[PDB]
Amino acid sequence: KIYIGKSSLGGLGVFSLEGIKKNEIIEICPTVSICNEEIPRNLVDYLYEGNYKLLPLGYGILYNHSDIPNAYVEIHKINKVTVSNNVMIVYAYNNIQKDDEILISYGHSW
Amino acid sequence: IQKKIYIGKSSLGGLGVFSLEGIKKNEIIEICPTVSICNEEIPRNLVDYLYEGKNYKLLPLGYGILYNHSDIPNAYVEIHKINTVSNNVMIVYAYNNIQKDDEILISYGHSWWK
């Protein structure tokens, strides 16, 4: 479904291996719960709310941000330290072509 | 250059990583990007899952931390350098030949206390 490559925005990004249609699931990321008193500061702009926060595995952390995003993120609970019973799902906001970079919002808006 | 693995409920309990097709000895199973975590900021539930970049330790992305461990391992791990995200990468290699839908398991490493 997805691959990693150098982004034209710099560093790494997630790309589309094929075509993704609007609202198709792009990736399902397992997550780890990180205790609020223990958050590494360089990870702050990457944790999600389910007392604790969630760190997405898979390529969850690697999606770049954009004011013009083609994807979006939702956190969902799953039927059950190590892995948490939450999951981060990435969906396509529009239709994405092969080898387009997949981009997501800043999360921060009023 | 593309994926070879999936996640499923493990026979060891919890989650595990499995083979989508057949994997041959020393073939690359997965290439994990890494995140550098400063020692002063290591989360305690994460201590036993970080790697040395040989002040900081490494969190492997992809399914890097999800591989179960075994005394009879069929896979192994190397940290490799390239010249937020770190310039290190964790590469997972097949130790024996791995069959379709075999669970990929990794050794404990050479320490007596880990």
PDB file of N, CA, C and O in Angstrom, chain A residues 44-104:
ATOM      1  N   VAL A  44       6.686  15.271  20.995  1.00  0.00           N
ATOM      2  CA  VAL A  44       5.449  15.970  21.295  1.00  0.00           C
ATOM      3  C   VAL A  44       4.539  16.213  20.074  1.00  0.00           C
ATOM      4  O   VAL A  44       3.345  15.927  20.114  1.00  0.00           O
ATOM      5  N   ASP A  45       5.100  16.697  18.976  1.00  0.00           N
ATOM      6  CA  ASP A  45       4.265  16.980  17.816  1.00  0.00           C
ATOM      7  C   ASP A  45       3.855  15.701  17.091  1.00  0.00           C
ATOM      8  O   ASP A  45       3.513  15.748  15.912  1.00  0.00           O
ATOM      9  N   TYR A  46       3.927  14.551  17.764  1.00  0.00           N
ATOM     10  CA  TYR A  46       3.596  13.277  17.121  1.00  0.00           C
ATOM     11  C   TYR A  46       2.746  12.354  17.983  1.00  0.00           C
ATOM     12  O   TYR A  46       2.493  11.225  17.581  1.00  0.00           O
ATOM     13  N   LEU A  47       2.364  12.798  19.176  1.00  0.00           N
ATOM     14  CA  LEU A  47       1.538  11.973  20.054  1.00  0.00           C
ATOM     15  C   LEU A  47       0.066  12.325  19.943  1.00  0.00           C
ATOM     16  O   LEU A  47      -0.275  13.464  19.672  1.00  0.00           O
ATOM     17  N   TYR A  48      -0.801  11.343  20.171  1.00  0.00           N
ATOM     18  CA  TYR A  48      -2.225  11.541  20.032  1.00  0.00           C
ATOM     19  C   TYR A  48      -2.913  11.240  21.319  1.00  0.00           C
ATOM     20  O   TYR A  48      -2.405  10.496  22.123  1.00  0.00           O
ATOM     21  N   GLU A  49      -4.064  11.856  21.526  1.00  0.00           N
ATOM     22  CA  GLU A  49      -4.870  11.575  22.693  1.00  0.00           C
ATOM     23  C   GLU A  49      -5.792  10.391  22.412  1.00  0.00           C
ATOM     24  O   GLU A  49      -6.421  10.330  21.358  1.00  0.00           O
ATOM     25  N   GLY A  50      -5.886   9.463  23.357  1.00  0.00           N
ATOM     26  CA  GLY A  50      -6.816   8.358  23.232  1.00  0.00           C
ATOM     27  C   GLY A  50      -8.243   8.807  23.493  1.00  0.00           C
ATOM     28  O   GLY A  50      -9.126   7.996  23.770  1.00  0.00           O
ATOM     29  N   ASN A  51      -4.267  11.309  31.023  1.00  0.00           N
ATOM     30  CA  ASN A  51      -3.208  10.727  31.859  1.00  0.00           C
ATOM     31  C   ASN A  51      -2.042  10.139  31.038  1.00  0.00           C
ATOM     32  O   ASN A  51      -0.945   9.997  31.553  1.00  0.00           O
ATOM     33  N   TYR A  52      -2.294   9.824  29.766  1.00  0.00           N
ATOM     34  CA  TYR A  52      -1.327   9.191  28.865  1.00  0.00           C
ATOM     35  C   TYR A  52      -1.490   9.713  27.432  1.00  0.00           C
ATOM     36  O   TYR A  52      -2.451  10.391  27.145  1.00  0.00           O
ATOM     37  N   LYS A  53      -0.530   9.446  26.555  1.00  0.00           N
ATOM     38  CA  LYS A  53      -0.651   9.771  25.132  1.00  0.00           C
ATOM     39  C   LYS A  53      -0.249   8.567  24.287  1.00  0.00           C
ATOM     40  O   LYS A  53       0.237   7.568  24.800  1.00  0.00           O
ATOM     41  N   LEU A  54      -0.467   8.659  22.988  1.00  0.00           N
ATOM     42  CA  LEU A  54      -0.287   7.518  22.133  1.00  0.00           C
ATOM     43  C   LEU A  54       0.769   7.771  21.094  1.00  0.00           C
ATOM     44  O   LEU A  54       0.721   8.757  20.380  1.00  0.00           O
ATOM     45  N   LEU A  55       1.692   6.828  20.991  1.00  0.00           N
ATOM     46  CA  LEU A  55       2.714   6.842  19.977  1.00  0.00           C
ATOM     47  C   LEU A  55       2.401   5.840  18.869  1.00  0.00           C
ATOM     48  O   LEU A  55       2.264   4.631  19.103  1.00  0.00           O
ATOM     49  N   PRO A  56       2.212   6.351  17.665  1.00  0.00           N
ATOM     50  CA  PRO A  56       1.916   5.457  16.553  1.00  0.00           C
ATOM     51  C   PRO A  56       3.158   4.735  16.016  1.00  0.00           C
ATOM     52  O   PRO A  56       4.194   5.356  15.770  1.00  0.00           O
ATOM     53  N   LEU A  57       3.034   3.434  15.819  1.00  0.00           N
ATOM     54  CA  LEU A  57       4.081   2.657  15.193  1.00  0.00           C
ATOM     55  C   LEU A  57       3.774   2.587  13.721  1.00  0.00           C
ATOM     56  O   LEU A  57       3.078   3.472  13.202  1.00  0.00           O
ATOM     57  N   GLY A  58       4.264   1.548  13.050  1.00  0.00           N
ATOM     58  CA  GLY A  58       4.255   1.544  11.603  1.00  0.00           C
ATOM     59  C   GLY A  58       4.917   2.838  11.160  1.00  0.00           C
ATOM     60  O   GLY A  58       5.862   3.323  11.792  1.00  0.00           O
ATOM     61  N   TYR A  59       4.389   3.449  10.110  1.00  0.00           N
ATOM     62  CA  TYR A  59       4.937   4.715   9.645  1.00  0.00           C
ATOM     63  C   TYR A  59       4.159   5.906  10.156  1.00  0.00           C
ATOM     64  O   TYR A  59       4.296   6.999   9.634  1.00  0.00           O
ATOM     65  N   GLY A  60       3.343   5.686  11.169  1.00  0.00           N
ATOM     66  CA  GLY A  60       2.536   6.747  11.755  1.00  0.00           C
ATOM     67  C   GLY A  60       3.257   8.068  12.002  1.00  0.00           C
ATOM     68  O   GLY A  60       2.733   9.140  11.768  1.00  0.00           O
ATOM     69  N   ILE A  61       4.484   7.985  12.480  1.00  0.00           N
ATOM     70  CA  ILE A  61       5.231   9.162  12.857  1.00  0.00           C
ATOM     71  C   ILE A  61       5.878   9.854  11.658  1.00  0.00           C
ATOM     72  O   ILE A  61       6.175  11.041  11.717  1.00  0.00           O
ATOM     73  N   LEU A  62       5.985   9.150  10.539  1.00  0.00           N
ATOM     74  CA  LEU A  62       6.754   9.639   9.408  1.00  0.00           C
ATOM     75  C   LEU A  62       5.966  10.483   8.381  1.00  0.00           C
ATOM     76  O   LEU A  62       6.558  11.092   7.493  1.00  0.00           O
ATOM     77  N   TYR A  63       4.641  10.500   8.464  1.00  0.00           N
ATOM     78  CA  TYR A  63       3.872  11.321   7.537  1.00  0.00           C
ATOM     79  C   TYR A  63       4.152  12.781   7.754  1.00  0.00           C
ATOM     80  O   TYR A  63       3.989  13.282   8.863  1.00  0.00           O
ATOM     81  N   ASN A  64       4.561  13.464   6.699  1.00  0.00           N
ATOM     82  CA  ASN A  64       4.792  14.901   6.800  1.00  0.00           C
ATOM     83  C   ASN A  64       3.511  15.724   6.915  1.00  0.00           C
ATOM     84  O   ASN A  64       2.397  15.257   6.686  1.00  0.00           O
ATOM     85  N   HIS A  65       3.679  16.971   7.296  1.00  0.00           N
ATOM     86  CA  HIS A  65       2.513  17.813   7.485  1.00  0.00           C
ATOM     87  C   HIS A  65       2.398  18.811   6.345  1.00  0.00           C
ATOM     88  O   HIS A  65       3.362  19.099   5.659  1.00  0.00           O
ATOM     89  N   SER A  66       1.197  19.286   6.089  1.00  0.00           N
ATOM     90  CA  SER A  66       0.974  20.214   4.992  1.00  0.00           C
ATOM     91  C   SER A  66      -0.290  21.016   5.250  1.00  0.00           C
ATOM     92  O   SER A  66      -1.208  20.521   5.892  1.00  0.00           O
ATOM     93  N   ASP A  67      -0.299  22.270   4.807  1.00  0.00           N
ATOM     94  CA  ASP A  67      -1.498  23.104   4.797  1.00  0.00           C
ATOM     95  C   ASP A  67      -2.445  22.573   3.717  1.00  0.00           C
ATOM     96  O   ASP A  67      -3.641  22.833   3.769  1.00  0.00           O
ATOM     97  N   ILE A  68      -1.912  21.821   2.752  1.00  0.00           N
ATOM     98  CA  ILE A  68      -2.745  21.169   1.735  1.00  0.00           C
ATOM     99  C   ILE A  68      -2.622  19.649   1.793  1.00  0.00           C
ATOM    100  O   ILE A  68      -1.994  19.051   0.929  1.00  0.00           O
ATOM    101  N   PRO A  69      -3.265  19.021   2.789  1.00  0.00           N
ATOM    102  CA  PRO A  69      -3.108  17.608   3.148  1.00  0.00           C
ATOM    103  C   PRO A  69      -3.951  16.670   2.297  1.00  0.00           C
ATOM    104  O   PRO A  69      -5.081  17.018   1.998  1.00  0.00           O
ATOM    105  N   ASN A  70      -3.468  15.479   1.976  1.00  0.00           N
ATOM    106  CA  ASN A  70      -4.322  14.554   1.256  1.00  0.00           C
ATOM    107  C   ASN A  70      -4.809  13.424   2.113  1.00  0.00           C
ATOM    108  O   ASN A  70      -5.472  12.528   1.630  1.00  0.00           O
ATOM    109  N   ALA A  71      -4.497  13.475   3.397  1.00  0.00           N
ATOM    110  CA  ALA A  71      -4.910  12.416   4.299  1.00  0.00           C
ATOM    111  C   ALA A  71      -5.235  12.913   5.679  1.00  0.00           C
ATOM    112  O   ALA A  71      -4.833  13.990   6.074  1.00  0.00           O
ATOM    113  N   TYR A  72      -5.931  12.100   6.443  1.00  0.00           N
ATOM    114  CA  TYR A  72      -6.247  12.503   7.798  1.00  0.00           C
ATOM    115  C   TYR A  72      -6.220  11.306   8.750  1.00  0.00           C
ATOM    116  O   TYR A  72      -6.212  10.164   8.330  1.00  0.00           O
ATOM    117  N   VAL A  73      -6.234  11.598  10.040  1.00  0.00           N
ATOM    118  CA  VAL A  73      -5.919  10.633  11.057  1.00  0.00           C
ATOM    119  C   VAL A  73      -7.046  10.481  12.060  1.00  0.00           C
ATOM    120  O   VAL A  73      -7.529  11.463  12.589  1.00  0.00           O
ATOM    121  N   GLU A  74      -7.441   9.259  12.384  1.00  0.00           N
ATOM    122  CA  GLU A  74      -8.374   9.073  13.495  1.00  0.00           C
ATOM    123  C   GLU A  74      -7.836   7.996  14.433  1.00  0.00           C
ATOM    124  O   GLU A  74      -7.167   7.060  13.991  1.00  0.00           O
ATOM    125  N   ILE A  75      -8.052   8.180  15.732  1.00  0.00           N
ATOM    126  CA  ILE A  75      -7.730   7.156  16.722  1.00  0.00           C
ATOM    127  C   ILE A  75      -8.983   6.321  17.093  1.00  0.00           C
ATOM    128  O   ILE A  75     -10.038   6.878  17.402  1.00  0.00           O
ATOM    129  N   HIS A  76      -8.864   4.989  17.047  1.00  0.00           N
ATOM    130  CA  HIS A  76      -9.987   4.072  17.317  1.00  0.00           C
ATOM    131  C   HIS A  76      -9.632   3.026  18.362  1.00  0.00           C
ATOM    132  O   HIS A  76      -8.504   2.552  18.405  1.00  0.00           O
ATOM    133  N   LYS A  77     -10.586   2.631  19.194  1.00  0.00           N
ATOM    134  CA  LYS A  77     -10.277   1.632  20.212  1.00  0.00           C
ATOM    135  C   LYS A  77     -10.369   0.246  19.588  1.00  0.00           C
ATOM    136  O   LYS A  77     -11.063   0.052  18.595  1.00  0.00           O
ATOM    137  N   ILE A  78      -9.616  -0.703  20.128  1.00  0.00           N
ATOM    138  CA  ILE A  78      -9.686  -2.066  19.640  1.00  0.00           C
ATOM    139  C   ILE A  78      -9.896  -3.090  20.733  1.00  0.00           C
ATOM    140  O   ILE A  78      -9.569  -2.865  21.893  1.00  0.00           O
ATOM    141  N   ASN A  79     -10.535  -4.188  20.347  1.00  0.00           N
ATOM    142  CA  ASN A  79     -10.768  -5.319  21.228  1.00  0.00           C
ATOM    143  C   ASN A  79      -9.449  -5.927  21.680  1.00  0.00           C
ATOM    144  O   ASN A  79      -8.758  -6.598  20.908  1.00  0.00           O
ATOM    145  N   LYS A  80      -9.095  -5.664  22.932  1.00  0.00           N
ATOM    146  CA  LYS A  80      -7.909  -6.245  23.534  1.00  0.00           C
ATOM    147  C   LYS A  80      -7.953  -7.777  23.525  1.00  0.00           C
ATOM    148  O   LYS A  80      -7.557  -8.424  22.551  1.00  0.00           O
ATOM    149  N   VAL A  81       2.644   0.204  28.173  1.00  0.00           N
ATOM    150  CA  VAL A  81       3.324  -1.013  28.553  1.00  0.00           C
ATOM    151  C   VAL A  81       3.946  -1.635  27.306  1.00  0.00           C
ATOM    152  O   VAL A  81       5.073  -1.291  26.896  1.00  0.00           O
ATOM    153  N   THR A  82       3.213  -2.568  26.709  1.00  0.00           N
ATOM    154  CA  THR A  82       3.560  -3.021  25.383  1.00  0.00           C
ATOM    155  C   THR A  82       2.649  -2.234  24.432  1.00  0.00           C
ATOM    156  O   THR A  82       2.582  -1.008  24.507  1.00  0.00           O
ATOM    157  N   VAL A  83       1.965  -2.928  23.540  1.00  0.00           N
ATOM    158  CA  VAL A  83       1.032  -2.301  22.623  1.00  0.00           C
ATOM    159  C   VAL A  83      -0.223  -1.864  23.381  1.00  0.00           C
ATOM    160  O   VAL A  83      -0.559  -2.455  24.406  1.00  0.00           O
ATOM    161  N   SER A  84      -0.869  -0.787  22.950  1.00  0.00           N
ATOM    162  CA  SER A  84      -2.130  -0.400  23.574  1.00  0.00           C
ATOM    163  C   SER A  84      -3.291  -0.884  22.706  1.00  0.00           C
ATOM    164  O   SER A  84      -3.110  -1.203  21.522  1.00  0.00           O
ATOM    165  N   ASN A  85      -4.484  -0.933  23.295  1.00  0.00           N
ATOM    166  CA  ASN A  85      -5.701  -1.285  22.561  1.00  0.00           C
ATOM    167  C   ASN A  85      -6.277  -0.115  21.794  1.00  0.00           C
ATOM    168  O   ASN A  85      -7.482  -0.030  21.573  1.00  0.00           O
ATOM    169  N   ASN A  86      -5.412   0.798  21.402  1.00  0.00           N
ATOM    170  CA  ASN A  86      -5.794   1.848  20.491  1.00  0.00           C
ATOM    171  C   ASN A  86      -5.028   1.672  19.212  1.00  0.00           C
ATOM    172  O   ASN A  86      -3.988   1.012  19.159  1.00  0.00           O
ATOM    173  N   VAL A  87      -5.547   2.276  18.174  1.00  0.00           N
ATOM    174  CA  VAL A  87      -4.967   2.163  16.876  1.00  0.00           C
ATOM    175  C   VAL A  87      -5.097   3.521  16.189  1.00  0.00           C
ATOM    176  O   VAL A  87      -6.018   4.286  16.459  1.00  0.00           O
ATOM    177  N   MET A  88      -4.119   3.885  15.393  1.00  0.00           N
ATOM    178  CA  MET A  88      -4.230   5.089  14.634  1.00  0.00           C
ATOM    179  C   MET A  88      -4.465   4.687  13.224  1.00  0.00           C
ATOM    180  O   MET A  88      -3.683   3.915  12.670  1.00  0.00           O
ATOM    181  N   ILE A  89      -5.537   5.200  12.632  1.00  0.00           N
ATOM    182  CA  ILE A  89      -5.845   4.905  11.248  1.00  0.00           C
ATOM    183  C   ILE A  89      -5.652   6.132  10.379  1.00  0.00           C
ATOM    184  O   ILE A  89      -6.074   7.218  10.731  1.00  0.00           O
ATOM    185  N   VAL A  90      -4.965   5.953   9.262  1.00  0.00           N
ATOM    186  CA  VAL A  90      -4.772   7.014   8.286  1.00  0.00           C
ATOM    187  C   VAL A  90      -5.719   6.813   7.087  1.00  0.00           C
ATOM    188  O   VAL A  90      -5.734   5.758   6.454  1.00  0.00           O
ATOM    189  N   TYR A  91      -6.516   7.822   6.784  1.00  0.00           N
ATOM    190  CA  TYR A  91      -7.446   7.762   5.668  1.00  0.00           C
ATOM    191  C   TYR A  91      -7.055   8.796   4.611  1.00  0.00           C
ATOM    192  O   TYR A  91      -6.479   9.827   4.943  1.00  0.00           O
ATOM    193  N   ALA A  92      -7.334   8.504   3.350  1.00  0.00           N
ATOM    194  CA  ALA A  92      -7.186   9.484   2.284  1.00  0.00           C
ATOM    195  C   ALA A  92      -8.338  10.532   2.308  1.00  0.00           C
ATOM    196  O   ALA A  92      -9.513  10.180   2.360  1.00  0.00           O
ATOM    197  N   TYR A  93      -7.987  11.810   2.278  1.00  0.00           N
ATOM    198  CA  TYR A  93      -8.979  12.874   2.273  1.00  0.00           C
ATOM    199  C   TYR A  93      -9.450  13.085   0.832  1.00  0.00           C
ATOM    200  O   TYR A  93     -10.634  13.269   0.590  1.00  0.00           O
ATOM    201  N   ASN A  94      -8.513  13.078  -0.113  1.00  0.00           N
ATOM    202  CA  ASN A  94      -8.840  13.030  -1.535  1.00  0.00           C
ATOM    203  C   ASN A  94      -8.322  11.775  -2.206  1.00  0.00           C
ATOM    204  O   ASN A  94      -7.833  10.878  -1.542  1.00  0.00           O
ATOM    205  N   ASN A  95      -8.416  11.729  -3.530  1.00  0.00           N
ATOM    206  CA  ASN A  95      -7.843  10.636  -4.298  1.00  0.00           C
ATOM    207  C   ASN A  95      -6.355  10.876  -4.519  1.00  0.00           C
ATOM    208  O   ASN A  95      -5.953  11.942  -5.004  1.00  0.00           O
ATOM    209  N   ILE A  96      -5.549   9.878  -4.166  1.00  0.00           N
ATOM    210  CA  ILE A  96      -4.103   9.970  -4.255  1.00  0.00           C
ATOM    211  C   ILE A  96      -3.530   9.097  -5.345  1.00  0.00           C
ATOM    212  O   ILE A  96      -3.853   7.908  -5.423  1.00  0.00           O
ATOM    213  N   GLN A  97      -2.663   9.674  -6.171  1.00  0.00           N
ATOM    214  CA  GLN A  97      -2.066   8.918  -7.259  1.00  0.00           C
ATOM    215  C   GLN A  97      -0.874   8.086  -6.808  1.00  0.00           C
ATOM    216  O   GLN A  97      -0.373   8.261  -5.692  1.00  0.00           O
ATOM    217  N   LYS A  98      -0.436   7.166  -7.664  1.00  0.00           N
ATOM    218  CA  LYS A  98       0.776   6.402  -7.400  1.00  0.00           C
ATOM    219  C   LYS A  98       1.954   7.345  -7.203  1.00  0.00           C
ATOM    220  O   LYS A  98       2.134   8.299  -7.956  1.00  0.00           O
ATOM    221  N   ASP A  99       2.746   7.058  -6.182  1.00  0.00           N
ATOM    222  CA  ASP A  99       3.978   7.788  -5.840  1.00  0.00           C
ATOM    223  C   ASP A  99       3.763   9.249  -5.445  1.00  0.00           C
ATOM    224  O   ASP A  99       4.716  10.026  -5.375  1.00  0.00           O
ATOM    225  N   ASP A 100       2.527   9.616  -5.137  1.00  0.00           N
ATOM    226  CA  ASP A 100       2.314  10.883  -4.479  1.00  0.00           C
ATOM    227  C   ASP A 100       2.747  10.741  -3.033  1.00  0.00           C
ATOM    228  O   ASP A 100       2.594   9.672  -2.422  1.00  0.00           O
ATOM    229  N   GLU A 101       3.300  11.816  -2.488  1.00  0.00           N
ATOM    230  CA  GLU A 101       3.577  11.828  -1.077  1.00  0.00           C
ATOM    231  C   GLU A 101       2.283  12.000  -0.315  1.00  0.00           C
ATOM    232  O   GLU A 101       1.464  12.806  -0.673  1.00  0.00           O
ATOM    233  N   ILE A 102       2.085  11.208   0.720  1.00  0.00           N
ATOM    234  CA  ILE A 102       0.913  11.322   1.564  1.00  0.00           C
ATOM    235  C   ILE A 102       1.144  12.332   2.681  1.00  0.00           C
ATOM    236  O   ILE A 102       2.062  12.163   3.472  1.00  0.00           O
ATOM    237  N   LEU A 103       0.327  13.386   2.721  1.00  0.00           N
ATOM    238  CA  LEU A 103       0.443  14.452   3.716  1.00  0.00           C
ATOM    239  C   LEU A 103      -0.798  14.658   4.605  1.00  0.00           C
ATOM    240  O   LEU A 103      -1.939  14.467   4.195  1.00  0.00           O
ATOM    241  N   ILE A 104      -0.542  15.101   5.821  1.00  0.00           N
ATOM    242  CA  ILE A 104      -1.507  15.121   6.910  1.00  0.00           C
ATOM    243  C   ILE A 104      -1.496  16.535   7.511  1.00  0.00           C
ATOM    244  O   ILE A 104      -0.565  17.285   7.256  1.00  0.00           O
TER     245      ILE A 104
END
